[PDB]
Every structure is written in C-alpha cells, then in structure tokens.
Symmetry: C2
Subunit: 275 residues, 2 copies
C-alpha cells in the first residue's frame, strides 16, 4: 500500500489544490470582452494560422438568469482575429495566479531557493493551467465549463488534429481522480530541466518521489484490467503536454510580436522585459 510519507504527500497536494483552485471561477471578474513587406507578410500568415487553430464561442450566464453569447467573426484577412485575445489574456492571468498560489502553499516548493521557484513556475505554469482546465472540460459537448462562463469549440475529427485539443480529449478519456490530477501538476511543476534551474539534483529527487507516489496510488486503488499501464499513459501525456507547452510558447511570442496583448504577469512569466 501507500507509505505514510506518500499519504502525507497526496494530502498536502490535495490541500493546496482545495485552497487555490476556484472551480466555480467565482472570483474571476473585471475581465475584458469583445467589443460591439515580405517578412511581416509571412509573419501574419503564420499568426493567422496560429489563431484559427482554436476557435471558441463564449457564453455568460448572469446571476439574474440572463444569457450573453458571443459568436466570433470569420477570418476575413483583418484584425478581427484578435477580438478574443484581451479576454483570453485575462482568463490565463487569472489561472496563472491560481497556479502560483498552488506552488507557494506546497512545502516541497517553499523550501526550494527563490531563484528556482521562479524558474520552475515560468516553465510549468502553462502546463498546470491546462491540467486544471481539463477537469472542467466537457468532452461530450467540446466545452470548458468555467462557472458562469463557457468556452464551446466551433464546428469534427479534423479538430482532433490540433495537438492541444487532442490532449484534452485523450486525458479526459482516462477518467482520472482528483489525486491523480494534482500529482500530474506536481510532476510537471518539479521538472528539473526548466531553463534556469540550479538545485536540480534536489528537484529531480522531488519529481521522482511524486511519480513513485502516483504509480503506487494507481496500483493500490485501480485493480481493473482497463487501467493497466495507466501510469505509463499518464507519463506519456506529461511528455506530450511539455511538447504542447513549447508549441504554444512560440505561438504567443509570434502573436505578441505583431499584436501586443500579454498582461504584465504574462510578460513576467514569458520573460518579456517591457523594453
């Protein structure tokens, strides 16, 4: 079974998740909404391809019972493709704060040197955000249900070609427990190979314990023949999520280069100096 140290480990992660994950998105407010050469040319063609990869409609359920719903414009070769960026930036900023709060609560993260905490956060923040959003993703309707907010994917099997969307569908299919999600966040956060990490003899030993715990958890609570190699499937997903993380980092920097949108917190995380 799980050792004591492993039980303590899961308990603290679950506790950090409980304190820092606003699953109802109640405190996400004041967000913005869509209003009512040769080198540069190739930049826009790539930027355009970057944005049309994930098109979502947007719904606001009001506390009174009212419903606002937004349908995005079609690509007509203009700046209409940038309409949902300020809102998306506000949502990700809100999520980043939750992730940062998640890390700071954890003892294994507190005891790390401050320069490594920042390095680890910069490298895994996006990955932890995606892991948290998978928990509220509805694979039956292709919708991220975020409290009063919904993000429904726009119209089939060709949508599953986008690596980000394929990841959410495949991860949802595994039907993970809350403990297994928060362990994935831990393993991703304590990746010893983010750019700038110093105490990576320490971080690597920490990450190995989180993986061992996850493997031990599955073996104790999942005897079904449908959950064989589940641990290895999860670890393969984390590797894919890291790939997706690198893909999106380049996407954002290209978009930001021709059409600024990143919030101060986003700039800090993605190393933008503002100069």
């Amino acid at each position: 079974g799980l050792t004591e140290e492993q039980r303590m480990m899961i308990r603290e992660l679950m506790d950090a998740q409980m304190k820092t994950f606003d699953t109802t998105f109640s405190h996400f407010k004041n967000f913005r909404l869509p209003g009512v050469s040769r080198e540069e040319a190739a930049k826009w063609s790539q930027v355009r391809k970057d944005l049309c990869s994930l098109k979502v409609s947007l719904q606001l359920r009001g506390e009174d019972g009212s419903v606002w719903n937004y349908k995005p414009p079609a690509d007509s070769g203009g700046k209409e493709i940038f309409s949902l960026l300020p809102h998306m930036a506000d949502m990700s900023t809100y999520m980043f704060k939750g992730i940062i709060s998640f890390a700071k609560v954890i003892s294994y993260f507190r005891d790390l040197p401050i320069e490594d905490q920042i390095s680890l956060l910069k490298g895994a923040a996006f990955e932890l955000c995606q892991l948290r959003f998978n928990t509220v993703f509805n694979a039956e309707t292709g919708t991220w249900e975020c409290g009063r907010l919904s993000y429904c994917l726009e119209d089939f099997q060709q949508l599953l070609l986008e690596p980000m969307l394929k990841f959410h569908y495949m991860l949802k299919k595994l039907q993970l427990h809350e403990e297994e999600y928060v362990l994935m966040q831990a393993i991703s956060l304590f990746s010893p190979d983010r750019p700038g990490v110093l105490q990576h003899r320490v971080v690597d030993q920490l990450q190995e314990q989180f993986a061992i715990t996850l493997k031990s958890y599955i073996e104790c609570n999942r005897p079904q023949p449908a959950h064989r190699f589940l641990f290895l499937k999860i670890m393969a997903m984390l590797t894919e999520l890291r790939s997706i993380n690198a893909q999106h980092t380049q996407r954002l920097l290209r978009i930001q280069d021709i059409h600024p949108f990143a919030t101060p917190l986003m700039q800090e995380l993605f190393g933008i100096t503002g100069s």
Copy 2:
C-alpha cells in the same frame, strides 16, 4: 386622380422621410447594454405586469462578422426586470430625434407657431415612432430588424393579446406603401387635440387635407377588391394607435416613478421637469 397640391404634399412628406429616417440605423451608437409598504407594494405588482408585456431578446451583428446575443432574465421578483430599460431608452431617444427632425423639415409644421410645434410633437412623437418601427417589423419571425440590431419577441396567440403587439401584426398585414405610412405619420402628427394646442382651427384643416390626400391616393393606386375600405381600416388603426399611445404613457410614468430611466429628451417630451 391626385390633384397637384396633393402630389406636392406627398412629395414633401416622402422627402422629409427620406432625409430623417435612418432605416439602417447606422448612426445609432454609444447605446447602453444589459450588464454582465402597501401602496408601493401594489406599485411594483403593476410595474412588473407592465414590463413583462413585451419581452424581447437582443442581437448585435458586428461589422467584423461577430454576433452578440442577449437572453433576458425570468421574472424572479427583483430588479432584474429593469435590465433592458437603459438600452430601450437610448433607442427611443434616437427615434425621437428622427421624428423631431421629420417634423421640422415639413413646411406645414414649420409655419405653425413654436408653442404648437412642441405641443404636437409631445403628443404624437411616440405614435410616429411606432409607425416607423412597423416598417422594419418582421411578422414572420416577430422581430424588429434595426440594421445590426434585432429585437425578437420571446415565446403564441396569447402574445397577440398585448395591444401594442396586436397593432404591429395587424398594420403589417395591410401591406402599405411608403407613401401611405408617411401619410399616417402626418395625420397623427397634426392631431388638433393634443394637450396645449392653440392654432387648432389651423391644425384641424391641415389634418383633414392629409386624410383626404391619403384617401385619394388609395383610390387612384389600389383598385383591387382586397383593398376595399382600406382607408377606413387605416383611420381605425390611427385611433387605436392613439389609445396605445395613452396606455404606454401611463406605463412609462409608473416605471419612472419607482425606477428612473428616462433620458433628458424623454423627460422633456413626457413633461418631467426634473424637480
């Protein structure tokens, strides 16, 4: 056939309509939108009944191709029933300006004394607004198509019980010409019996000429057995519209009494002194 003076008459009304009716609602902007005792008690019960009589959903077509759509809240015994009032006030204010511009262009209206112009406008502005909105009303879908804006009625035959809605459906059924609409506006505007009218020996003779012209127009351009007594049907509608005008005046004053919403122009037209 039509006399010369009658031809001149229709020409000037059509010209005034062409200049002051923004049928595409292009210049209607900066409007507000729904956000994201024993005596008083009976006041609210009446006010609540006044508001639920005409419930509409609201659509914004963006110039980029985007679509915002708003579903109103259900009546839950709170101030949620006042959500669409600021927007409605901005639309009616925009319409009133069009009607005022319509009147000032007309020579028969210019030559009236200034104290009678105000009196006539205060008494007929709402009626002329309704006449203009009937021209953009879609009876097949129960929707007022106002350029990039739509106002669709909320879900049957019981909706036809509301006098305002019954008026729009019945007037639309007559399939009037543009000339016949603008003549209805004239007859309504030059009603000699608005409160405060002085030169009503003059206004009455003016109104009679507009009616005679309308009757003459129909007899010259509508020989079909389906348009028999059409003139009399129209005149009966104008009488009903006057009734509806009085009904809505009381509605507004009750709502305004417990929940202020009227714009400065609306206050001026409905005699509110701001004191």
